[PDB]
Design a binder for this molecule. Sequence first.
Ligand SMILES: CCC(CC)[C@H](NC(C)=O)[C@@H]1[C@H](O)[C@@H](C(=O)O)C[C@H]1NC(=N)N
Ligand SMILES: CCC(CC)[C@H](NC(C)=O)[C@@H]1[C@H](O)[C@@H](C(=O)O)C[C@H]1NC(=N)N
Ligand SMILES: CCC(CC)[C@H](NC(C)=O)[C@@H]1[C@H](O)[C@@H](C(=O)O)C[C@H]1NC(=N)N
Ligand SMILES: CCC(CC)[C@H](NC(C)=O)[C@@H]1[C@H](O)[C@@H](C(=O)O)C[C@H]1NC(=N)N
Ligand SMILES: *[C@@H]1O[C@H](CO)[C@@H](O)[C@H](O)[C@H]1NC(C)=O
Ligand SMILES: *[C@@H]1O[C@H](CO)[C@@H](O)[C@H](O)[C@H]1NC(C)=O
Ligand SMILES: *[C@@H]1O[C@H](CO)[C@@H](O)[C@H](O)[C@H]1NC(C)=O
Ligand SMILES: *[C@@H]1O[C@H](CO)[C@@H](O)[C@H](O)[C@H]1NC(C)=O
Ligand SMILES: [Ca+2]
Ligand SMILES: [Ca+2]
Ligand SMILES: [Ca+2]
Ligand SMILES: [Ca+2]
Lengths: 389, 389, 389, 389
Amino acid sequence: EWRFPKSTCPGRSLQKMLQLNPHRHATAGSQAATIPNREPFISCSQDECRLFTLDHDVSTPGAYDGITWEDRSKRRRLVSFPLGSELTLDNMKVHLSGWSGTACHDGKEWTYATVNGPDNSAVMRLKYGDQIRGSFPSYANNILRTQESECVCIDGKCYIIVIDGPAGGTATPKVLVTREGEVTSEIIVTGRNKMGEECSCLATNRTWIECLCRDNAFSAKRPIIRIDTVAGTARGYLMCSDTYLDTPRPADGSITGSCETDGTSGGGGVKGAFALSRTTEATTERFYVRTVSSSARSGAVFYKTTDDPTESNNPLTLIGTAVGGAIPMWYSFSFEIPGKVCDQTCIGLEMGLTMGHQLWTSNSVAVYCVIGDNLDWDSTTDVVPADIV
Amino acid sequence: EWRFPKSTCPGRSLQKMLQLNPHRHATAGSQAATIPNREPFISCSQDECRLFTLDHDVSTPGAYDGITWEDRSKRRRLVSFPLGSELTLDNMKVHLSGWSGTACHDGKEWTYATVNGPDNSAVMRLKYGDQIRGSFPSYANNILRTQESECVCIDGKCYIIVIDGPAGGTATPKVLVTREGEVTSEIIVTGRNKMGEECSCLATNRTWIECLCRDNAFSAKRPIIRIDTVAGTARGYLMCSDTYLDTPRPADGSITGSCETDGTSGGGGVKGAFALSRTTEATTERFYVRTVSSSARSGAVFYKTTDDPTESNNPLTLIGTAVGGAIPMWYSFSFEIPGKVCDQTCIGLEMGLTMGHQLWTSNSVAVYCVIGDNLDWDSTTDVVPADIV
Amino acid sequence: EWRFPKSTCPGRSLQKMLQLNPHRHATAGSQAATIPNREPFISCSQDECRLFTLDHDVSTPGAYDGITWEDRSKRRRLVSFPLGSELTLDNMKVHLSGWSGTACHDGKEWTYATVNGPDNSAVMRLKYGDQIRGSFPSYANNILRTQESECVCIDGKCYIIVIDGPAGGTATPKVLVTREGEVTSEIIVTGRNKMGEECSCLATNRTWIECLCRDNAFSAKRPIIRIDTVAGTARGYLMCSDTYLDTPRPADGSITGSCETDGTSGGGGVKGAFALSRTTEATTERFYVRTVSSSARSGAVFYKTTDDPTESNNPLTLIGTAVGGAIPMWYSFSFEIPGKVCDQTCIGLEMGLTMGHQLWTSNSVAVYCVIGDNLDWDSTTDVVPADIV
Amino acid sequence: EWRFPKSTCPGRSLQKMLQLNPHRHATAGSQAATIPNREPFISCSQDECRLFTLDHDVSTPGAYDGITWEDRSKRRRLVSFPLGSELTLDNMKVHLSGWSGTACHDGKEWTYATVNGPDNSAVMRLKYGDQIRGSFPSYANNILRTQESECVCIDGKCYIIVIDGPAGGTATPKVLVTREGEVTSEIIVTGRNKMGEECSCLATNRTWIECLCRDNAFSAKRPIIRIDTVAGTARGYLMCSDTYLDTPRPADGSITGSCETDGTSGGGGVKGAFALSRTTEATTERFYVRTVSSSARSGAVFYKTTDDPTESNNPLTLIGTAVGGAIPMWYSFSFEIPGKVCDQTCIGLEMGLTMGHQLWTSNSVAVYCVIGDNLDWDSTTDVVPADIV
Ligand SMILES: CCC(CC)[C@H](NC(C)=O)[C@@H]1[C@H](O)[C@@H](C(=O)O)C[C@H]1NC(=N)N
Ligand SMILES: CCC(CC)[C@H](NC(C)=O)[C@@H]1[C@H](O)[C@@H](C(=O)O)C[C@H]1NC(=N)N
Ligand SMILES: CCC(CC)[C@H](NC(C)=O)[C@@H]1[C@H](O)[C@@H](C(=O)O)C[C@H]1NC(=N)N
Ligand SMILES: CCC(CC)[C@H](NC(C)=O)[C@@H]1[C@H](O)[C@@H](C(=O)O)C[C@H]1NC(=N)N
Ligand SMILES: *[C@@H]1O[C@H](CO)[C@@H](O)[C@H](O)[C@H]1NC(C)=O
Ligand SMILES: *[C@@H]1O[C@H](CO)[C@@H](O)[C@H](O)[C@H]1NC(C)=O
Ligand SMILES: *[C@@H]1O[C@H](CO)[C@@H](O)[C@H](O)[C@H]1NC(C)=O
Ligand SMILES: *[C@@H]1O[C@H](CO)[C@@H](O)[C@H](O)[C@H]1NC(C)=O
Ligand SMILES: [Ca+2]
Ligand SMILES: [Ca+2]
Ligand SMILES: [Ca+2]
Ligand SMILES: [Ca+2]
């Protein structure tokens, strides 16, 4: 009946599943209406996986595709594609207008959620199947926004992280608890809770969720939020490892102080992701990504640890380079593939493609999942934005 | 088994679901065969919603797309798209040739109905699943025509409003009662029944339907038709509110006399729509749309009331501007999304796009549904017809 | 379980269902890969109807589409489209290579059949679901060929008419009896059996089939073949009505002699079609089509009769002009839409489109079904072949 | 429940099913994004057949399609199409990144497998449904690679042939045994086991599999591998017939010595295929293909035998020319169509299309299945690579 977390399929590393690269088809002579997009992610039901992303109501090539750099507008929608379909106009399915998104399947229906509206009074609407069942207004009146990756559903209830407030300062996240798309409760995030953008969330066992977020103001350490779905509580932490996962970031280990010490820099950031191995009782290993560059959104490097990331300052263990440092690499996202026997967690990579500041902007998506013992290969795009017509 | 009206999902306002904007993809350099169309509407089964519209047997860009301004021809067909698929040639499904349309799902199969033929001897054909099961000839021999929005099915019977006669004068509507697409009875509309074009109809409780129509000859007040499906009776009214919903219209409240008093102007009009909240016994709130302009089809403004619209002359309560007054806004349509637990009603907006008189003509469709407490955002097209190639 | 003929849905005339017109989208500026084709027909299961046709392994516009006039080649395939999908490359489903085709659903699976090979040693292959289950070699070594319209399945067995031999002389048709695509018997056509091309076949009651064919050598009267599926017998007749249905043809009634008298002319011909009303015991009315012109394949006119067409020389009763006489009109085909309550028969029209002799060739398909009391409207293409790019 | 081999449908020859020829649509004026590809094959479930192939993350026409000659890269993916859909961008489904592929349905889910990574440390990943369940690293560190045709599943276990090592020398194949995509055992190939590339495998009865492979270093005779799935053993043989099936090859019968004698030449080769007739206990006839030319990959000729191909040096019996000798013909592949009553085996043909050395490269796929008594027709492409735009 309801989706719930199972023990994960055996795996000790990350290996490539697939890559979608629609703008390979947007060169001179090509015959395709490709869909430029940003903030992509994947979510799955027991029947299918889907690539969700935020579009711009436009295809490339085309005269209107110059707006694709914008973060928020009346054009953007949460749309999706069967996973493995290329990102073309005829493959696209529009779910909700809006400029920040999440989605997740509870075992019976999809919940889709976007934020729509002006920056000072935006509204999250939640769609369950075909109906808008939930509505959640801005509480801080400063760009209400959500994860840009899948939410987590356990036992008929789905858990969505939202935040509202200055992107350059204190902004308190909330956990929304939904049932059939209706917001039935809010969970207050206690502890280290002054930031937490764009959380990537995975169940750590049968009843707990862990979210890896972005602190856009205070620290190059990533916030971690843990949700006890049985108690209905959530607590914020700061990831303690010397291997800081955000971008930009200082040199590894150089932030002096306790685990929850911010560090001197910390302005800016990027959405990050992780994957894991777990039993029904505990997470046994975590897999992390960060950029190659400590200053720019370029490259992707995988790491792993069996330590508790909220407690240990130990460096993470190098797995290897999934995207070379010369290649733009922007957001990354967690997702889980539910199975009949075991579940599997994965990391997707937004390999960014852009002509420059306030010019055409999109991406290619590469997907790596927890399986095997060593990284198999790195990913490239072989797309030169100058060639996009 | 059969579709029947349930109590609606909680909601106290209208908020945006999504928007389809196919001709964003019809600019220079684009690679899409988009489908120019007019009179769009949405209807849903328990399995899916579909965007229905009347096409012109042509895609844009293309040499033949200059006929898309025509109301009636041998080219037009009732076609549909899965709701959320963009309006492209490969996504299109053709149901019936004809130039006026309606469709509705009874819980087992779709009923599709169009009027086809010459103006003086047109025939409505009704298709149930794959078979043409019903045929209804013109009775006034002057453009037999129907709702341009979904019909309503209750307990295995569907209810369709048709009209026939001068668009500039008295034309008596009829309610057709269908079963598996066969016209099994006609219901005579009593009361205020001298007009009633393009009705948007929704169940007001378990057994009654209310239709909001267009009086194209006599009044800027919209006719309302109520159907008792158990008694098999229908009565026409004139909407009494000082907030007149048709376009063009005089200033609010300025029509002197009783509720059913026509007013001095009233020539012309536009299809209108409403949505509602209801229990199994009664409608508890109604939501209405009209243009911003009192003379031109531009803008869309939402209103609400808990009054009986056939009795009270009270002004409606302003919800807000869904489409700015500088933006063309033509037809609007009601539809209902059936649910396993509750039903939901919505308003769709035909945001018109045209190069001018007897030139290329189509639209973008914006959808708002009953949910939340305040209007979230207004809709734009960002399509300049001059840019369509 | 198995498909079998039911009594037909009430109807006393022919009225338009829909029209597919893919090459409306093949003009300058258009963005569609349309599928030029000839010999189209429709067949249905209980789940869906499909438009079948013979393609040329090419789309229009395109450099190779100049071969589309050819009757037979190594390029042609039996392909199909969900009925109502337009005839574009992405909508197409290829079933079997070959240059003469038929298909029919037995209630469990599709049987598809084409003839493939050189003119003097062609082979019919029959595909049941995904497997080639049947193979039937040429017996007269002179263009083995079949109906170019749907076959008929009753009680798990399907009935296919084939012919082999000179198109300008005596060629004896055979009825193939298939089960799961395997040819399990051949039925010898007795009686008037010296010709019978391209039969359009419909059940006349629970156990009999009637086929309306083309005599390409001897007569402007159409051969009729009746199959008793219980006895496993088939007999050929010549349609007796003074209203001769083939093209070219002499003036009505001018063939002197008995019903089976050929008449002096008779060379050439065109595939024809009919529809009917029936109970489980008998056919109660038949509907026929022929061209407007008695010398050229132009126009389509509908007729009806309650007489036995193998016995009565009475003129048929005029229903009216479905396609004006200025419009090319080539093949027509019978098909049946099975229903849960009643079946429905229909006639489809190949409205031909061509640039001329040995130049680009295709069509638009218009569909009329048995329903209502009067013809509703005639069909046009509004496609000028000169405009096809 | 589980797929297992049934007795095959009656048939004594090979006859054409269908052909897919996407680049017919890639000429001047065309409107299609076609998918250039190599190493195509077909695999089927009980629900559908699919055309699998290895793409290049590009469509034709398009600026990037010049890489399509490459064997291995970070661009290639195992993708598939419903069998009968043409090979266009919107029809494509991406399964796994990688440059060598196989896939097979076990009755419940698809197993897809590709090799990904650098030549010296490639990794096979196996995807079962939506999850990566298996991972198998290179064991000889020299282009780990697999069949380029479907694997075989029997009783819930699937059998995949892999090889690793010098393509110009001794390279030992292994049989991987998978369950839900997990590699549960490896079977050592005994006997004649020093080579065995790109095996085409079919069940020979209820519990045994036979694979026809390519010896790329030592012999123009094809290796044959037989797997006893009950014992879990596999043995390699050399095909003994005087009719040598590889290309290039010496004149028939001219290799002096025993069945397992290599012969003096043998460098190079091409993937080959066979089909068969079988009961539940034994294979009763085998059907083979080889090129027309003994030196170039051109033409295709069918043969048959009732002898044991590992024992008898008798020449095979000529069936006939399926592809004329002037037409490029590269890989061929075996596949089986499972049925409710009987199974059917087939041979597919990669009719190669290329502009030349290190230039644009793709193919057309022709399919022949075991049915009938004589070859019906040969296949052509009628594609001139010079015309591809
Ligand atoms: C202003 C707050 C930002 C999040 C920390 C901002 N989010 C939204 C909803 O606008 C993101 C940020 O500006 C962009 C990025 O860092 O790449 C993407 C952008 N995200 C979206 N456009 N959805
Ligand atoms: C002449 C009667 C009119 C309805 C009041 C007319 N309806 C039809 C069937 O022609 C509508 C009207 O002329 C147009 C409009 O007002 O926008 C649309 C147009 N509707 C359609 N073309 N379907
Ligand atoms: C030579 C015998 C003819 C049938 C009487 C011929 N049939 C075939 C299989 O070639 C038809 C005829 O030449 C053409 C026509 O009359 O329109 C179509 C053509 N039919 C097809 N090309 N499938
Ligand atoms: C180097 C080993 C070769 C197999 C014997 C080589 N295989 C791979 C995985 O590269 C094949 C060979 O080079 C090409 C051919 O012979 O056509 C195809 C090519 N196969 C693929 N590109 N998948
Ligand atoms: C999941 O983990 C949390 C934190 O370690 C623990 O309190 C809880 O009991 C665990 N749940 C189960 C079902 O073991
Ligand atoms: C629906 O409303 C009508 C009009 O108010 C009323 O007569 C009827 O009884 C109601 N139906 C139900 C089931 O309450
Ligand atoms: C169908 O019609 C034929 C010919 O008139 C007749 O012989 C047969 O009995 C009929 N079948 C049934 C089931 O009535
Ligand atoms: C299949 O064939 C092998 C080899 O001939 C034989 O050993 C085995 O018994 C056969 N299996 C069955 C089920 O007959
Ligand atoms: Ca930061
Ligand atoms: Ca009016
Ligand atoms: Ca004739
Ligand atoms: Ca060799």
